[PDB]
Write a protein that binds this ligand. Structure first.
Ligand SMILES: [Mn+2]
Ligand SMILES: [Mn+2]
Length: 200
């Protein structure tokens, strides 16, 4: 129980790519948060970042706004999305402001997770231990119509502001990853004590 920090630290190392982990550690230390003392926060950041990459790498985009999968596009001579999560927050805000300026659109008040070059919209991603619909409308309160929302729960429910933002195979990649993580956390008795994103 007091070893829950070390158990979560170890879990993180065994369940995520080194690249994912290093970014999350860096963002916590920007908030002057010790990952060793706030392991729940480190886990949540890792999952969030991994989901954003799972959404962004799924398709690529050409000059005229046509999308391709990685296989379809290879050799033709960018990722459909700019990933704003995963970098220091000062650099993140530079990116969001540049993207808005480049495209002649408003700059959202809050920091986005992704930017979709196809629709020219910012996207917020959320992962909840609770009901996705609840979290969705909680974010809507603050965000309004400034961004699209993609909310996923560990319990396989989800809520999307734009249903065409994910095919059923992309949804299945995200949700299956979350289901697998919850099963493992449950087996380690780490699930009940995890503080989800929706309570931060
Ligand atoms: Mn964010
Ligand atoms: Mn988010």
């Amino acid at each position: 129980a007091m070893g829950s920090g070390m158990a979560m630290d170890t879990f993180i190392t065994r369940n995520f790519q080194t690249t994912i982990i290093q970014k999350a550690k860096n963002t916590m230390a920007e908030f002057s948060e010790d990952p060793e003392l706030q392991p729940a926060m480190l886990f949540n950041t890792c999952v969030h970042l991994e989901v954003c990459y799972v959404i962004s790498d799924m398709n690529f985009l050409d000059e005229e706004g046509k999308s391709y999968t990685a296989l379809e596009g290879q050799g033709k001579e960018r990722p459909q999305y700019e990933v704003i999560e995963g970098m220091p927050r000062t650099i993140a805000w530079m990116v969001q402001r540049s993207l808005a300026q480049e495209h002649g659109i408003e700059t959202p008040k809050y920091l986005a997770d992704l930017f979709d070059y196809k629709t020219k919209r910012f996207i917020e991603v959320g992962i909840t231990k609770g009901l996705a619909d609840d979290y969705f409308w909680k974010k809507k309160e603050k965000l309004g119509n400034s961004m699209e929302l993609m909310i996923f729960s560990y319990n396989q429910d989800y809520s999307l502001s734009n249903e065409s933002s994910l095919d059923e195979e992309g949804k299945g990649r995200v949700l299956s990853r979350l289901t697998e993580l919850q099963a493992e956390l449950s087996l380690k008795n780490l699930w009940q004590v995890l503080i989800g994103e929706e309570d931060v």
